[PDB]
């Protein structure tokens, strides 16, 4: 009866409260998705339990075993009843799980250390001094793996063979790499996360160029779940009322430190 929510520790969507050790259950977390989960649950009339995805991944299907990992996997195999996180709506995922209409719009973008002589994806593709990569088991990596677009095709050709690996396990790892590489590493990540980090000390990174694509994050449920319909209506109601915009301002800019 209590709905099991799978989510991921990704700032500012879900973060551990400073005093989480003295708190219980859902109260241990804070963030955009924590606030949204409470609202979705309230509007859909269900009790829930926030759980962090075991493998800390978003969701990809292994080409060899064909098994789904990450939050998608937890939904596919029945470990969670719903995923409320910055989970990108994609065709391959839509084929195995259901997604609500987008609660956030975004696109792949470029994050550089301030001062890096890069202004676009084309710029990155035409040079070799500056390395660049993406997150693992995510929609961004898949975007490049599948792109038939010349520029992105070139970029994938480079990234998949670059040594040492230009891929990272978590967004935080990618951000740290940019900050410590003296401008020799640029990170490809969704505009949402890029924009957030841009407003965080040490204020040494910035988003450059236009988004490479346009898509959205959706609340996901197991294929054919009974919660799907209500969850989708709730997302639309909250967006139409202005809550989603308020929540983004709250976690991105209201407490911006740059
Ligand atoms: N939002 C992405 C993860 C982040 C990324 O791939 O850049 C996903 O659902 O896979
Ligand atoms: Zn802790
Ligand atoms: Zn409400």
UniProtKB/Swiss-Prot annotation:
Subcellular location, record wording: Cell membrane; Postsynaptic cell membrane; Postsynaptic density membrane
Keywords: Cell membrane, Disulfide bond, Glycoprotein, Ion channel, Ion transport, Ligand-gated ion channel, Lipoprotein, Membrane, Palmitate, Phosphoprotein, Postsynaptic cell membrane, Receptor, Signal, Synapse, Transmembrane, Transmembrane helix, Transport, Ubl conjugation
Binding site for L-glutamate: 86, 88, 93, 139-140, 190
Site (Crucial to convey clamshell closure to channel opening): 118
Site, as annotated: Interaction with the cone snail toxin Con-ikot-ikot: 61, 145, 237
One GO BP: regulation of receptor recycling
Record bears the keyword Phosphoprotein: yes
Domain of life: Eukaryota
Induction (record text): Down-regulated in the pyramidal cell layer of CA1 in the hippocampus by global ischemia.
GO cellular component entries: AMPA glutamate receptor complex; asymmetric synapse; axon; cell surface; dendrite; dendrite cytoplasm; dendrite membrane; dendritic shaft
Modified residues (Phosphoserine): 147, 181
Ranges in the topological domain labelled Extracellular: 117-258
Tissue: Detected in forebrain. Detected in dendrites of neuronal cells. Expressed in the pyramidal cell layers of CA1 and CA3 and in the granule cell layer of the dentate gyrus.
Post-translational events: Palmitoylated. Depalmitoylated upon L-glutamate stimulation.
Disulfide bonds: 203-258
A single MF term (Gene Ontology): glutamate-gated receptor activity
Domain notes from UniProt: The M4 transmembrane segment mediates tetramerization and is required for cell surface expression.
Comment field (misc): The postsynaptic actions of L-glutamate are mediated by a variety of receptors that are named according to their selective agonists. This receptor binds AMPA (quisqualate) > L-glutamate > kainate.
Biological role: Ionotropic glutamate receptor that functions as a ligand-gated cation channel, gated by L-glutamate and glutamatergic agonists such as alpha-amino-3-hydroxy-5-methyl-4-isoxazolepropionic acid (AMPA), quisqualic acid, and kainic acid. L-glutamate acts as an excitatory neurotransmitter at many synapses in the central nervous system and plays an important role in fast excitatory synaptic transmission.
Description of how the protein assembles with itself and partners: Homotetramer or heterotetramer of pore-forming glutamate receptor subunits. Tetramers may be formed by the dimerization of dimers. May interact with MPP4. Forms a ternary complex with GRIP1 and CSPG4. Interacts with ATAD1 in an ATP-dependent manner. ATAD1-catalyzed ATP hydrolysis disrupts binding to ATAD1 and to GRIP1 and leads to AMPAR complex disassembly. Interacts with GRIP2. Interacts with GRIP1. Interacts with NSF via its C-terminus. Interacts with CACNG2, PICK1 and GRIP2. Interacts with GRIA1 and SYNDIG1. Part of a complex containing GRIA2, NSF and NAPA and/or NAPB.
Family: Belongs to the glutamate-gated ion channel (TC 1.A.10.1) family. GRIA2 subfamily.
Protein name (record): Glutamate receptor 2
Annotated organism of origin: Rattus norvegicus
Gene symbol of the encoding locus: Gria2
Residues of the whole record sequence present: 414 to 794 of 883
